Amino acid sequence: DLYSRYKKLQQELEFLEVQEEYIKDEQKNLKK
Amino acid sequence: HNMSVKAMRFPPKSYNKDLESAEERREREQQDLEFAKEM
Amino acid sequence: DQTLKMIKILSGEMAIELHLQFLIRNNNTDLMILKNTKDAVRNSVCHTATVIANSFMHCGTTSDQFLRDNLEWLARATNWAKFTATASLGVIHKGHEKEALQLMATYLPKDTSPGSAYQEGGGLYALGLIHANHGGDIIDYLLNQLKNASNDIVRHGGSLGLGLAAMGTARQDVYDLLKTNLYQDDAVTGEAAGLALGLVMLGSKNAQAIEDMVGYAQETQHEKILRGLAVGIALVMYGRMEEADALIESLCRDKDPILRRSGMYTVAMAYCGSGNNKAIRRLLHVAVSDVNDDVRRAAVESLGFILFRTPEQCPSVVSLLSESYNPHVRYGAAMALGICCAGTGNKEAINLLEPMTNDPVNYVRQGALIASALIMIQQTEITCPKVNQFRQLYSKVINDKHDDVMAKFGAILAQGILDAGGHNVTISLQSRTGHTHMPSVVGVLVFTQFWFWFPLSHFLSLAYTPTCVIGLNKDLKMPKVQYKSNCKPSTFAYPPNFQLLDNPARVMPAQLKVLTMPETCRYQPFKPLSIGGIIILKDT
Amino acid sequence: AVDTAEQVYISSLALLKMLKHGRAGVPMEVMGLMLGEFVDDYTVRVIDVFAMPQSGTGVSVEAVDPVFQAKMLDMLKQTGRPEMVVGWYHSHPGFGCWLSGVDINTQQSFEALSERAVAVVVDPIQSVKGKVVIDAFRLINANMMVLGHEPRQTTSNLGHLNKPSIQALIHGLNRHYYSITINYRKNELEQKMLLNLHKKSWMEGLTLQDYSEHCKHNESVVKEMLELAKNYNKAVEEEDKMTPEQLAIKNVGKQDPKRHLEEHVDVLMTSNIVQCLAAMLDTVVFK
Amino acid sequence: LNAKVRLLREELQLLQEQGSYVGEVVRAMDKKKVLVKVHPEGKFVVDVDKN
């Protein structure tokens, strides 16, 4: 099936963006 | 300068090693503290 | 006729009877472990932990041998801890309502009225342990007892019993009584009243009730009342999705930490199982942005409730947060990992939890041990090689006197929950129908709030779901049929590859795909095979 | 009986008063009494404290002196403050937190007057820029321990978050008295008021300094920059002629230009940039 | 960064332990025994750690 590949790609993109965001926040707080 | 610092941390990799002081020394320290307190 | 269909479907007595029969017939547990561990008890914490483990180990088996024979050890408890003992009586006698009242008057000396009245008040709460959802007029009977308002302990016990027994009744009288009790301004009974108000209004989403509760909690002199009301105001608006958002923005701005924690609980409960990006992003940003500490634990722990539909997603994010600087984040991550994938013994969470088992902080070790126990409820040694290691680790840490208290409290709770229900029950993170189970979610939330009051631990029993296969040919008489497995006996070993199983024989969730239908037998299943639950087998 | 979840709430003014009073009399043990209320039997609030006259030539003062205490109590009421005393406090300079032998007898009087008092101990010289050392204690009786029972029945796990120090264990502590948790109540008004410290007027941010000392400072800095520049290559050349295991120890007695030049660069850039920008906007703010 | 911060806190914690003397060894013995002499006291016969 090909639909699952599509949905998995969107899920991975969004989830990686969220991870990147809170890692940036972590790096900001650590020096403080 | 900014470019240089942008090419800084590429070569480091696989540095998961994180040990602070020891593994079983905490038990020895606690035992010594308890022995000192008892005396 | 229609009367029998109503009795079977609406009353639900037949389902409870079948579950009780499955639990009683297939009750397999080792009683020597409790006897061995009792000899190491030398503190009130150890006594309470042992009572909790004994109650959790024989849930629904109606076997009170340990409590009856060890009355000398049970007499050591006193004051509010004694009330907890009453809750134990509610664990063994789950169901079997026809004798519940006769059991209560058998054990609770209400007419005697001893010097310690607590042992009576908790008895009311014990009623909630029996009547899970089919309260009926008996629940109304509690409304009589709650009318006494003799003292704070009695009122608290009555409120807890009424809230537990009549969950979701949405009765107006219960809401009025809860509002009056909250307005009574009592420092010891107010928490139970708030819990009852939160429980008895589940799914109502009444704007007036929520506004009144928020106004009452905005101005109160007792911290206990605020902490009790935080979970009630969170639970009153369960799983309504964006409808809850109007409240959330209000609770994420209050300077009071308890209100922020309540907001985190509301976010977690209103987005159960839905992979929202915004909800996860905000719930995880709060866990690093705010300056307080308890709200960090709440925010980190609340992620577990919203990833249980995709169990293989938690280790992707909390792995980096597990080694944070402060122990609160570590405890939250460990407990979230334990609570998310509790349905099955995942082989990825164990490697993450292993380093936390010997962390310098004691309470993070206790949380990690509880998470490890809950993540691995119904596994075998062949499926996962961590059974023997973790069992012997629990045994070794529970028998060493040099460890501090609550370091082994998690261990004894782990030993009690490992053999829960005689291995005839399991965690209920996801139901067989693909929908979230309200009693399991409520029990999980109550267990997550165990840091504020120990006597609230027993509510975890609301998340236990039996794991057995029952086939019938007649609604009143059970048939004599056989079922055959297809795998080796080692994989399906209980606590040749064609083993025969009877009509009420239990089968593990991981070994339910190798069951063979008895084609040779005359009886045949109307519903499809290879699925759990009670099914009617047509006779041919 | 009593539980381990008992809480005490200390305001900001009380903390600062007691800290200043304790720091003033560093070589001896000063003492005073608190005041507040018991809203319930889980939390005790203290709202104000006051010092008391002491008898010199010693390090301990008996708390029995009714005239001063009575006068202060009946005089504070005339301007609000209807509260009552809840306990006493004294300071241990550089020792720690515990109750000496005489302290049990001293707190026995307050226990007799009211069975639910508390003793607060503050360390004035072991605290710096945070982590003020303050502890709170209550006494126990040995007859109840003879009965094979222990006080402070435990109902939750929020009472064992801090492990006691070894010096507290060395003295009496758990075999003579029990410590209780502590908390500080904060509100928005006083916190917003308190952050005005070290704030400067609008005049200090528009002065552009003298144009004569600035060039002297730049000239001074440039010469040491030159000398460190000359000394850099000598250390650069021999960076690998010696085994790196002793490389770190080689820099234990003499300075290194690499670390010792960056600070020069930073201060110089900051001063020049800010001095330029100030004049830049000032040329047009005024006429 | 997180490793640095945690190491700093633990380094603060572990500075309240006793020091260790320095001494001169004269000669060893059998079954892990040595004889040493530290100047502000006499001669001590002691054992050796496992490493």
From Swiss-Prot, chain A:
Subcellular localization: Cytoplasm; Nucleus
Superkingdom per UniProt: Eukaryota
Similarity-based family: Belongs to the AAA ATPase family.
Physiological role: Component of the 26S proteasome, a multiprotein complex involved in the ATP-dependent degradation of ubiquitinated proteins. This complex plays a key role in the maintenance of protein homeostasis by removing misfolded or damaged proteins, which could impair cellular functions, and by removing proteins whose functions are no longer required. Therefore, the proteasome participates in numerous cellular processes, including cell cycle progression, apoptosis, or DNA damage repair.
Subunit structure: Component of the 19S proteasome regulatory particle complex. The 26S proteasome consists of a 20S core particle (CP) and two 19S regulatory subunits (RP). The regulatory particle is made of a lid composed of 9 subunits, a base containing 6 ATPases including PSMC4 and few additional components. Interacts with NR1I3. Interacts with PAAF1. Interacts with TRIM5. Interacts with ZFAND1.
Descriptive protein name: 26S proteasome regulatory subunit 6B
Full-protein residues shown: 39 to 70 of 418
Swiss-Prot record, chain B:
Compositionally biased residues, Basic and acidic residues: 15-39
Subunit structure: Component of the 19S proteasome regulatory particle complex. The 26S proteasome consists of a 20S core particle (CP) and two 19S regulatory subunits (RP). The regulatory particle is made of a lid composed of 9 subunits including PSMD3, a base containing 6 ATPases and few additional components. Interacts with UBQLN1 (via ubiquitin-like domain). Interacts with ERCC6.
Record lineage: Eukaryota, Metazoa, Chordata, Craniata, Vertebrata
Record organism: Homo sapiens
Residue numbers of the full-length protein present here: 487 to 525 of 534
Protein name per Swiss-Prot or TrEMBL: 26S proteasome non-ATPase regulatory subunit 3
Residue span of region Disordered: 14-39
General function of this protein: Component of the 26S proteasome, a multiprotein complex involved in the ATP-dependent degradation of ubiquitinated proteins. This complex plays a key role in the maintenance of protein homeostasis by removing misfolded or damaged proteins, which could impair cellular functions, and by removing proteins whose functions are no longer required. Therefore, the proteasome participates in numerous cellular processes, including cell cycle progression, apoptosis, or DNA damage repair.
Family label: Belongs to the proteasome subunit S3 family.
From Swiss-Prot, chain C:
Swiss-Prot/TrEMBL GO biological process terms: proteasome-mediated ubiquitin-dependent protein catabolic process; regulation of protein catabolic process
Start-end of each PC repeat: 84-117, 122-155, 157-191, 192-226, 228-261, 262-297, 298-330, 332-366, 367-407, 410-442
Keyword Phosphoprotein applies: yes
Residue positions, PTM N6-acetyllysine: 401
Keywords of the record: Acetylation, Phosphoprotein, Proteasome, Repeat
Disulfide bonding pattern of the chain: none
Keyword flag Acetylation: yes
GO cellular component terms given for this protein: azurophil granule lumen; cytosol; extracellular region; membrane; nucleoplasm; nucleus; proteasome accessory complex; proteasome complex
GO molecular function, one term: enzyme regulator activity
Record function comment: Component of the 26S proteasome, a multiprotein complex involved in the ATP-dependent degradation of ubiquitinated proteins. This complex plays a key role in the maintenance of protein homeostasis by removing misfolded or damaged proteins, which could impair cellular functions, and by removing proteins whose functions are no longer required. Therefore, the proteasome participates in numerous cellular processes, including cell cycle progression, apoptosis, or DNA damage repair.
Family: Belongs to the proteasome subunit S1 family.
Protein name: 26S proteasome non-ATPase regulatory subunit 1
Gene name of the record: PSMD1
Residues of the whole record sequence present: 320 to 917 of 953
Swiss-Prot record, chain E:
Cellular localization per UniProt: Cytoplasm; Nucleus
Annotated consequence of substituting residue 9 to Q: In a colorectal cancer sample; somatic mutation
Record's subunit section: Component of the 19S proteasome regulatory particle complex. The 26S proteasome consists of a 20S core particle (CP) and two 19S regulatory subunits (RP). The regulatory particle is made of a lid composed of 9 subunits, a base containing 6 ATPases including PSMC5 and few additional components. Component of a complex with USP49 and RUVBL1. Interacts with PRPF19. Interacts with TRIM5. Interacts with NDC80. Interacts with PAAF1. Interacts, in vitro, with the thyroid hormone receptor (in a thyroid hormone T3-dependent manner) and with retinoid X receptor (RXR). Interacts with ERCC6.
Record-stated family: Belongs to the AAA ATPase family.
Role, per record: Component of the 26S proteasome, a multiprotein complex involved in the ATP-dependent degradation of ubiquitinated proteins. This complex plays a key role in the maintenance of protein homeostasis by removing misfolded or damaged proteins, which could impair cellular functions, and by removing proteins whose functions are no longer required. Therefore, the proteasome participates in numerous cellular processes, including cell cycle progression, apoptosis, or DNA damage repair.
Name used for this protein in its record: 26S proteasome regulatory subunit 8
Native organism: Homo sapiens
Gene this protein is translated from: PSMC5
Shown chain mapped onto the complete sequence: 52 to 102 of 406
